[PDB]
Symmetry: D2
Subunit: 374 residues, 4 copies
């Protein structure tokens, strides 16, 4: 029994604590550890309950979504809910997925820079790419290599592998594919040393200009027009005040702070709340939060508010990892995107990415209105 | 709980799959603590598996670190890093700075006027007046410094202050409002555009946080004996150093990273933050870290490692730390709540634990990448 | 008419005969507006060929500014020896660079490779909605879409060959980065004309599209930008060399170990602490600037052309020798057009054997010059790093 | 006694070509001879034909500005103006080989002049040097950092630093740790000099003093790239380096129409989408402008500044807004936090460059208010950049 195994572990742990009675408030009973153990967590001593609230309906692409948000930050859900209301009263939001492809960026080294330059040229030919793709794609049915971006630093060569991965976030799958392609590359260049399967050129879980500029995972754009009456009555401000704050805070302020990818008010709050509720990798909030929020006067009198959010690097999935646990599957089902999209692999993950971008836009609208109105 | 059950009933009627909520738990949870403080429109809670890594031998003390995660092998890998550190005599850490920030943006009619306000804020009399207004909002709010930046007629003011054992965003924002109200008495022509002009910078990647710090700045170090590198980490000191330089330094530089000179600090920070009731969205800046390794000892075979994190945003009082399950994890570490005798000591100790655990995580993953053990 | 008579008619190159006199009159007129009338006394203007300058390189000309030119070399690069001209007013720069060349020469020379070649222009256009700009982005990503744009782009010149497109969306805005070869010219003018033509063609397919600016800062030209560092701009070059232990000791006055420790902690860790993007070197900008001024390049392009990462490591059977490499992804350079049309700067290009067009292999002179710049930067890095390591200031 | 004899003697493996001047009794002759020696090593011996070398005062250059001199490179100098700034009019010299740069800048000055002029302010002044030192352990480096942050520690360091020059005044110390490494950014005024030499000397003295209190400390490099000098860096953009300046102006609607050939609305739309959004898409730190580097570079070459410093000196954010009764006037401002400039020392010691500094009325030291000539020049650069931004933006907006 897994539940008793966790029980004993807590007893064994209890003796090493200065306050052994602390564990009494950490839950562990009535939980399915079958799905957890050997797949999601080790040395398990219980679980941490995170409150889940709902924001919506989010009117996006002619559909209505009830968005689950796991958070301990007061007013986050209520504020986001107000943004959804403004969007709904304005006829809804529209979104588009611009790119899709998870990456892995290993670093290999050759004896000389002249050699790494030779390897770079070969990878850039249609023939070089084709053989590397064949080796990469042979690891899984969903791993389809789309492109390579190679960069050198002397005798070092950084290779950014970008690939589709069905409805999965893709890290494991893309990593397995990269290992096989690097092995194949080694057969063509025996003098090549594989330094690390990840040379930080992906880039995974670290802020990086490469993710902002080339994208990682899903690149999405969302937009909406909020009528002047709605800006006044629901957001309690004016279109002019919203625009002035957007330019001076999200553009100029972020520029003064030396930000790369942080041209928004609080995309990270929304991304994180949705990620925790839906079994995503919350640590990926680092790059997934990249966003530029733009606002413009619209309509016959420049009284309406046009808003758009562009997020080039949303790392998300509806199969694998934490999405295999039942409570998180319930949240994915709420959105209608749980598991693989059998009819068209990747569609569930793309829909979830659009929902994230649309919810972020609702969050931006609400916070900006509050800052503008005081 | 009855209101929650009813909200769930109403919500289920708007879903494409009315049974979605079946596996989303909600019973046997105390919502009196959540309602009106941590979350709104509550429909239940999301259980995140909690594992333990340790003991972490830090500053002559041993810690059992709780980590909430759904990523397989993260806890086990971190645990291996702790083992290597423990076998090497432990780690040492130091808090270099402490101060949460808020960076509002105000505007004057002309750039010549904003320059005038700036010179004023830089005199001892100007700062004393602002500090008096700022510090009157709370017993624990003490303004340490001001950093101002001009962009034409706009002026960005970065207020930095201690906040006891609280993360401090609320306290600092209140003090900022009072200080600005006071500044407006001296400059009636000044317009307060937004209490946050993204110059803080909160929840967005920013060079200012990396360079000037935000929250707690911490450094930690350890020396791993050659025999431990071989037997516990399964690699050599030379392989570790080569990977650190080419991945964490050169690779991050090729990717255009600001503050991402590490392997996976974000994973550790996020896991600890969720378990301990911190703001997980703050993982964006809190994850900033530079990992350095070098050879030491009699024969240059031992491994010296250090991790420097200039912007850990953390607290042991307020927000999610008011909930019982998260207090249990803080108690496990011996840092729950306020430190009555020396305000801020519990928060500082938690920051040191985070930096030491990150270092354990870096050691383990780097060894795996170096040895080619995936 | 006398000078005093021409002045009263004013209260020039087309009016007066010779150019030197036009400049002389302009100087006399300007003098009146000066609080110190004799300011221009030491600003030379005589014996200079203004015919190549007027209506091409500068306007409202009042003379010329002499910049001292020194020579560093021989630079042993790719089995050839170069005598590098450097225009500078900074003491010890030429001597220091010369020392670096010596170390490289004593070590058997340096090797270099051009990894990429393509100047860029990044305009910004707008559509009524983001859903529309997304459609345009998708259209440009098709083989047929790119085919038509390339056709329009390429028709503007024999040397204009569009290699690729990189598009980025920001709401209803679309930034398009055009990249193309340009023979031996730096290519900004050629690429800008091709861009204009390609955008007109694009407008035929999407009439609702507004061309906001031919340059939307997505190029990026003369501003520090991560896009140039990551995707390159102009010529991307890498050079390397191995300096024998004996040479490090006797010529550079230090040790391989001290050099490596300084490189890692200054060029890597220090630049990381400073929040630098592309500045992982000691002083590439000094060399780039000195060569650019001497060879008629656009000195303002030093901003991105200076991007460089310098790496050092122990080498040889005993790990005693010094391996060094410099990688510069965005060298914006040319041997035809602009300042390279002036005689004194052509003299410096001729010294290097790269002046003008390479009729046999277009672009070869510009590529060779880029390799020389990267090799000279490496010589400069070696020398300054050795000085910092040994403490010889 | 003859060039041919001297050359034969040199070729007899006795003297390197660089120490020619220390043997001949005339600088110009050493140059002439070095050219002849260089000629025989070129694939094309006549290449030096059009590179001038005669009628130039090499006494100021040798041993101070350049070595192995073979001549000089003439850069055309044009004038843009008058630039109406702070109730004064300036005639700005610009050395460039880029067509239309001077004419375009001149058009921007005209628009500014017709609008009543520009206003500017110097917000900060202080050159920096950022050495890197190492302690045995990170716990030791943390200790040095805490010590430097005390009033006593700073006082001791300031005393050693300031003793190098009367113009040197250590304003602050920004330290950052990376494990056992400690980066210390020294910032100080330097009179009218750009200050790199003075600040480096003071840094060396301060580090020697610090080493007396921490003998375990190793000085790795007087410059650890934390200055940061001649490399793009967020620290310069955020904390400033040299002079931080802001300038502004209001261009009347009629002037935007008639002189700039566009509208206020078109200019604002281009500024936001190019200088703000475009630069953000490109991942720029400090490059929120159209072409500040062109103006900075042209002025720097003409005035004897260090042109390689264009890297950080060109940092600039250009902002435009609708202003006036009907929101048709154009308000513009340029903010440059890191202008590295000086009116004494280096290239400013040469006569032709002093002529350009005199044209602006800022040549040499300001006798009655040290640093005032350098500050005035920084304001001129920022105002000229603003004129350049106005003109190019109008051209891009109008098509
Ligand atoms: C409940 C929440 C949406 N939320 C936050 C605060 C949100 C923070 O987490 C992120 C924010 O710091 C990002 C930024 O704007 O830089 C604020 C708020 C923000 C800035 C401020 F100065 C004072 C209060 C706020 C105000 C009204 C309603 C909800 C609010
Ligand atoms: C369980 C975990 C510690 N964890 C991760 C992978 C961890 C990732 O989340 C972060 C990582 O992506 C950061 C980076 O290094 O860029 C890997 C791993 C990492 C990179 C790779 F190519 C293959 C496997 C790994 C290997 C062995 C044991 C644990 C591991
Ligand atoms: C003649 C020159 C090559 N050059 C420079 C100084 C070079 C500077 O322009 C760039 C440098 O500042 C870049 C950097 O290192 O960050 C120095 C020098 C550098 C730092 C120092 F503290 C003192 C002197 C130097 C020393 C010996 C020989 C030539 C030198
Ligand atoms: C003479 C000059 C003022 N100058 C330049 C070109 C200026 C370039 O050096 C810098 C520019 O590239 C910076 C940028 O905006 O990214 C252009 C120009 C600029 C961009 C373009 F697509 C076409 C022409 C231009 C147009 C009219 C008048 C002068 C101009
Ligand atoms: N529609 C789908 N999209 C992606 N993966 C799918 C799908 N259906 C099934 N799978 C399988 O589930 C796995 C995805 O989870 P996992 O292996 O943990 O990798 P990842 O880290 O990408 O989530 C793959 O082994 C794949 O074969
Ligand atoms: N005035 C100078 N002009 C050009 N190069 C110089 C000059 N002084 C020194 N050098 C360069 O520096 C190298 C070092 O010479 P020097 O400083 O005399 O030291 P050492 O002779 O002890 O090696 C020389 O080989 C030369 O390349
Ligand atoms: N205003 C100034 N700013 C910077 N350096 C200055 C200034 N005035 C003088 N100097 C420096 O001091 C040197 C000598 O001038 P100064 O100190 O005034 O003494 P003196 O009495 O010999 O003129 C000059 O060569 C220059 O380097």
């Amino acid at each position: 029994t897994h539940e008793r195994g966790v029980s004993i572990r807590r007893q064994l742990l209890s003796k090493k604590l200065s306050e052994p009675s602390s564990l009494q408030y950490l839950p562990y009973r009535d939980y399915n550890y079958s799905l957890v153990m050997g797949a999601c967590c080790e040395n398990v001593i219980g679980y941490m309950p995170i409150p889940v609230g709902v924001a919506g309906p989010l009117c996006l692409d002619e559909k209505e979504f009830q968005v689950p948000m796991a958070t301990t930050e007061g007013c986050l859900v209520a504020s986001t809910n107000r943004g959804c209301r403004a969007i709904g009263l304005g006829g809804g939001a529209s979104s588009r997925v611009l790119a899709d492809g998870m990456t892995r960026g290993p670093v290999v080294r050759l004896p000389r820079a002249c050699d790494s330059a030779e390897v770079k040229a070969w990878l850039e030919t249609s023939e070089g790419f084709a053989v590397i793709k064949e080796a990469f794609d042979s690891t899984s049915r969903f791993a389809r290599l789309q492109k390579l971006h190679t960069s050198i630093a002397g005798r070092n060569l950084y290779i950014r592998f970008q690939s589709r991965s069905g409805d999965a976030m893709g890290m494991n799958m893309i990593s397995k594919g990269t290992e096989k392609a690097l092995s194949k590359l080694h057969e063509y260049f025996p003098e090549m040393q594989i330094l690390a399967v990840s040379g930080n050129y992906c880039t995974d879980k670290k802020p990086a200009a490469i993710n902002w500029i080339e994208g990682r995972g899903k690149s999405v754009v969302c937009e909406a027009v909020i009528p002047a009456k709605v800006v006044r009555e629901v957001l309690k401000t004016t279109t002019e005040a919203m625009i002035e704050v957007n330019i001076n805070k999200n553009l100029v302020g972020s520029a003064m702070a030396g930000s790369i990818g942080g041209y928004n008010a609080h995309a990270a709050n929304i991304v994180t709340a949705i990620y925790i509720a839906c079994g995503q990798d919350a640590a990926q909030n680092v790059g997934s939060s990249n966003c530029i929020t733009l606002m413009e006067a619209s309509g016959p009198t420049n009284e309406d508010l046009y808003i758009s959010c562009t997020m080039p690097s949303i790392e998300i999935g509806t199969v694998g990892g934490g999405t295999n646990l039942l409570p998180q599957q319930a949240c994915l089902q709420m959105l209608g995107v749980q598991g693989a999209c059998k009819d068209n692999p990747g569609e569930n993950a793309r829909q979830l990415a659009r929902i994230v971008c649309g919810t972020v836009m609702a969050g931006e609208l609400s916070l900006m209105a509050a800052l503008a109105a005081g």
